From a paper:
The 2-deoxy-D-ribose-5-phosphate aldolase (DERA) is an enzyme involved in nucleotide catabolism. The enzyme catalyzes the formation of C-C bonds between an aldehyde as an electrophile and acetaldehyde as a nucleophile in a highly stereoselective manner. The structures display a canonical TIM barrel fold built up of eight β-α repeats in a toroidal arrangement, with an additional N-terminal helix (α0) directly adjacent to the C-terminal helix α8 (vide infra). Furthermore, all DERAs investigated in this study form constitutive dimers.
The X-ray structures of both psychrophilic DERAs were determined with resolutions of 2.1 Å for C. psychrerythraea and 1.8 Å for S. halifaxensis. We note that the relative orientations of protomers as well as the characteristics of the dimer interface for both psychrophilic DERAs closely resemble the situation in the mesophilic (E. coli) enzyme. Comparing the substrate binding pockets of the new structures with DERAEC, no amino acid exchanges or significant conformational differences were found within a radius of 5 Å about the natural substrate (as represented by the covalent intermediate included in PDBID 1JCL12). DERAs from psychrophilic species had a similar thermostability and were around 20 K less stable than DERAEC. In contrast, helices 5 and, particularly, 6 and 7 show markedly reduced strengths of rigid contacts in the psychrophilic enzymes. The relative B-factor distribution of the backbone atoms reveals a tendency towards increased flexibility in helices 0, 6, and 7 of the psychrophilic DERAs, compared to DERAEC. Hence, our X-ray structures provide independent clues in favor of the hypothesis that adaption to low temperatures in psychrophilic DERAs involves a more flexible environment of the substrate binding pocket. While in DERASH and DERAEC the melting point of the oxidized form was still lower than the wt value, the exchange led to a marked increase of 8.4 K in thermostability in the case of DERACP. Further tests for the DERACP-A95Cox variant revealed a much longer half-life at 50 °C (>80 min vs. 1 min for the wt) and 86 ± 8% of the wt activity. Nevertheless, by installing a disulfide bridge in the interface of DERACP as a psychrophilic representative, the melting temperature could be increased.
Residue numbers in the entry:
A (entry chain B): 3 to 248
B (entry chain A): 2 to 248
Amino acid sequence: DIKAVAQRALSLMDLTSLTNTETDQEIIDLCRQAKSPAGETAAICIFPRFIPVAKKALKAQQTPHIKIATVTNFPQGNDDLDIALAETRAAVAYGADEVDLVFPYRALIQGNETIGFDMVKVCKQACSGNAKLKVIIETGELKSEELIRKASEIAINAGADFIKTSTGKVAINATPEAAKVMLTVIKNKNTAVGFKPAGGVRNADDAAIYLDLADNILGNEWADANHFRFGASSLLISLLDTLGHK
Amino acid sequence: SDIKAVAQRALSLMDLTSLTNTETDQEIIDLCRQAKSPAGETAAICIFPRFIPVAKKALKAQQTPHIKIATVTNFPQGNDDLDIALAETRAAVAYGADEVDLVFPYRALIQGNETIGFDMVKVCKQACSGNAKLKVIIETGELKSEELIRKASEIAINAGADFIKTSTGKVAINATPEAAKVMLTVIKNKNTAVGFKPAGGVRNADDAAIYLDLADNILGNEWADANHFRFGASSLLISLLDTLGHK
């Protein structure tokens, strides 16, 4: 049932806007859009400086349960620990519920597994008692199964609450192949860790591919809002269309 | 005053500013480079909060640790939402700001709400405790009247402002001699430890002399060092260096 899929995917969305030129009105408008005719998305995902305005709008429309996710070390995934930590500290101070941190994947590709652990760990510590930490490993740039698995393992060891496939800002983002690798790592290490495919999920058919992977690898009941998110934007209109809201 | 001497004096009091909100890392590094000028270092740079970590790294790499990093919050609108201004100020501190330039809720003051201005400046001052100085932009170009400019200054100072600053640079009217005179007089009458920062429309040494002469005459010759006086400006630097004969 494609409508059941669409309804389920909508409730797991991190409704994303990351143009870096948003106006405050566009952020208010995004929060309004997250309060959809078929229900609320799980979250929004926006740049840190927009969090106070978003928190205010979400509260005014009586949907404070819609989480505010943001991004740090983004999009490049540089290997500078001081900068990533400063941004994550600021994201928390802005009022973020969740921080989507970009893993230093280029450093990993060059054989440095240590900076990735260190960066994820100190940023996790900075979120303590305030926010969840998602870690973006950028699977489209890691390419190989070995690297995708390895980044996933390091991120979980260092304390990630979610592992996320992509920034959305590179050539290749979420893929079924990458998703299967990451979901499998989650199963083998810690089923408490969530999974977030981002970029390339545009309709209910795409959503079903990733939901079916999660259901088949981790069980039918695993992928709730605490364990599964879609990083997406245009997906919401497509899902609403599928659900009969043109 | 001697115009070249003023140029030299004014340069060391600059908060070299870039607030386009479309800067890249490279433009921030370049701003830091410019602040290390052939005539001496500016007192600070002033940039949006998210650029502070890159600026910090760049300032360290060119070995200019004493150039402070200032930023802006509640900016530029000066809205009267305390929670938003507080959260931005906390983030600015978390990013690593040395100084936070907060916009006072001046439209609320114009409508007769004097309390929100006090409360907002105070909680933001508290958020800076141990980490940063708080400057308060009262937007004199919008307050317009001497009475409102004096009142916003008094409120900012009572609530704990380390500096009072004339303008955001984002409205039609910014620093003016008239506004400066009122603000410097309030400082003189309430607390000479509070600094003054004319900002916006200061484009050359002639402009700078106006504000330095006012400070000198009202508070004394020794008063306006970098702890008590800043110029909020950008293209001013190039103008001063040209006046000083530097390339």
